[PDB]
């Protein structure tokens, strides 16, 4: 995906998930990013940890470069929150994240990468459209119709578990991202 894109990244990071599994979260990010073609020209990263609380693990206003992305990214410590809170985070996206005080570009289409094992513990809306979700439900505990109505018109990325996430989800990730669509 080589693109003019503002990608949010939404890790749940709750008690839930754990932090093998969050790391997991964490790897298949970091190969999303990876595989993103990520620079101050291109594709614009924020990164998002949420549980009990959300977390702006790395603002779009923070240097876009793929190395100080990673880096931070792999600085992420895992919160463990008792709580998925789901709509909190995305409020964070559509009144923060994607915010051009906060580094968003206007021009640039939102995309956001969803990752959530557990249903939201929170009141969740469908973002405005300007911030198209992604929702990578991962694991049985995944909410799916909630992803879905989080994730319109992106249908939910559902992937079995955490451990085949970094393995499975990247190439989905980024067909959606090139493309602007999920596969079929
Ligand atoms: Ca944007």
């Known amino acids: 995906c080589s ?8 890790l749940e990071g709750s008690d839930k998930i ?5 790391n997991r979260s964490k790897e298949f990010m970091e190969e999303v990013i990876q595989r993103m073609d990520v620079g ?36 992420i410590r895992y919160q463990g929150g008792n709580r998925t809170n789901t709509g909190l985070a995305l409020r964070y996206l559509s009144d923060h994240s994607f915010l051009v005080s906060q580094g968003d570009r206007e021009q640039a289409p939102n995309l956001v990468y969803m990752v ?14 300007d911030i198209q979700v992604v929702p990578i439900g991962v694991g049985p505990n995944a909410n799916v119709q909630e ?30 991202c090139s493309s602007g669509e999920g596969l079929e």
């Open 147 to 176: 992803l879905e109505r989080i994730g319109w018109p992106n249908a939910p990325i559902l992937i079995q578990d955490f451990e085949t996430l970094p393995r499975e989800a990247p190439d989905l990730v980024l067909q959606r």
């Open 3 to 10: 693109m003019v894109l503002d990608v949010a990244f939404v």
């Open 116 to 129: 959530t094992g557990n249903p939201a513990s929170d009141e969740i809306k469908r973002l405005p459209g």
């Open 40 to 75: 101050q020209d291109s594709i614009h990263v924020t990164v998002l940890q949420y549980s009990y609380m959300v977390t702006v693990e790395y603002p779009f206003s923070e240097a876009q470069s793929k190395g100080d992305i990673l880096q931070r990214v792999r600085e």
């Open 18 to 22: 754990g932090e093998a599994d969050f």
